Amino acid sequence: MKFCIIGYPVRHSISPRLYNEYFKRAGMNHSYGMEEIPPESFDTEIRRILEEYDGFNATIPHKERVMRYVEPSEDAQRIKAVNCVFRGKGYNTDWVGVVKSLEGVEVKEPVVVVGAGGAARAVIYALLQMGVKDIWVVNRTIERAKALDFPVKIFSLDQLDEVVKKAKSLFNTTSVGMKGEELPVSDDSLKNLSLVYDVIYFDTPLVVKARKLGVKHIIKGNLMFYYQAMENLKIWGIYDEEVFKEVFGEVLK
């Protein structure tokens, strides 16, 4: 079977190397590639993808976009985002990644979620599944705020500093931090949080700051990535637990 990751950007994705190493170690003939498709070319180029690959992952900015071209699951519909496709069917494994990444951890409220994209909606869904009630979304764009149907409060990014001060958990779901950017939030607001969670795979200024301040739990995007990958492989019917732990376990250290 053939798989890939689609998105924009996606050329620096960590997925191809990991899935390909996994397939090789498991003695499987499967392959994992990459397709960096600009938004303006998506409608034409997705048809090629659907014909050439058995399944694929979707990342920014295509998780919501790809829904029109597949049959989404009930949870993917609620989230309005598909990040895992298999033979015409769309799924969301991001929220599963979030739930499993927080195993053994009590998520204290109120919870601030930065962003309102597909990643944010997956995080919100996960939090609601975990019985979290008080969720405050802080985002940048009007369009994405209007796509939110969840029982949340919505604030603009200039309010981030004030709202985090009144919260106990913070989730960054945006790409802010990928190129070393900082969110508009003070040490004073961050210091008494019990959880700082960043969907970004590597150290961000937010994560580094949280460590400096001694925040109890500081979780980067590596656990979320690990567990969404696990769910992807289960959906694709190609999950080998021991090989997965050996190969994908490298993202955890």
Domain at 233, CATH number: 3.40.50.10860
Residues 110 and 154 in one domain: yes
Measured in whole angstroms, the distance separating CA 208 from the mean position of its chain's CA atoms is: 20
**CATH at residue 146:** 3.40.50.720
Task: Answer yes or no: do 87 and 105 share one domain.
Answer: no
3-state class of 219 per DSSP? strand
Gap between the Cα atoms of 152 and 125, Å rounded: 11
| Same-domain check for residues 202 and 251 | no
User: Is residue 212 located within the same domain as residue 100?
Assistant: yes
Residues 207 and 225 in one domain: no
Domain count, the chain: 2
- Residue 63 is among the residues annotated as catalytic for this protein: yes
Query: Binding site for NADP(+): which residues?
Result: 74, 115-119, 139-144, 199, 221
Spatial neighbors of 199 by CB under 8 A, at least 6 apart, are 119, 123, 171, 172, 173, 221, 224
Same domain for 189 and 110, yes or no, is yes
Number of Cβ atoms within 10 Å of the Cβ of 202: 12
The DSSP code for 69 is G
Distance in angstroms between the alpha carbons of the first and the last residue of the chain:
29
Q: After which residues is the chain broken (C to N over 2.5 A)?
A: none
Residues 51 and 117 in one domain: no
Structural resolution in Å: 1.5
In the three-class reduction of DSSP (H, G, I as helix; E, B as strand; rest coil), residue 130 is classed as coil
Residue 176 and residue 248 share a domain: no
Question: Which domain range does residue 111 map to?
Answer: 93-220
Co-location of 120 and 180 in the same domain: yes
Q: Looking at the structure, do residues 79 and 179 belong to the same domain, yes or no?
A: no
In this structure, the answer to whether residues 68 and 131 fall within a common structural domain is: no
How is 148-167 classified by DSSP, letter by letter? --SS-EEEEGGGHHHHHHT-
Q: Which of these, 244, 235, 250, lies nearest to 93 by C-alpha position?
A: 235
Experimental method: X-ray
Active-site residue, from 2, 24, 63, 209: 63
Same domain, 80 and 97: no
Binding residues: 13-15, 59, 74, 83, 94, 115-119, 139-144, 199, 201, 221
Closest C-alpha to 56, from 8, 107, 2, 111: 2
Q: Taking CA 57 as the corner, what is the angle to CA 232 and CA 142, rounded to the nearest 5 degrees?
A: 120
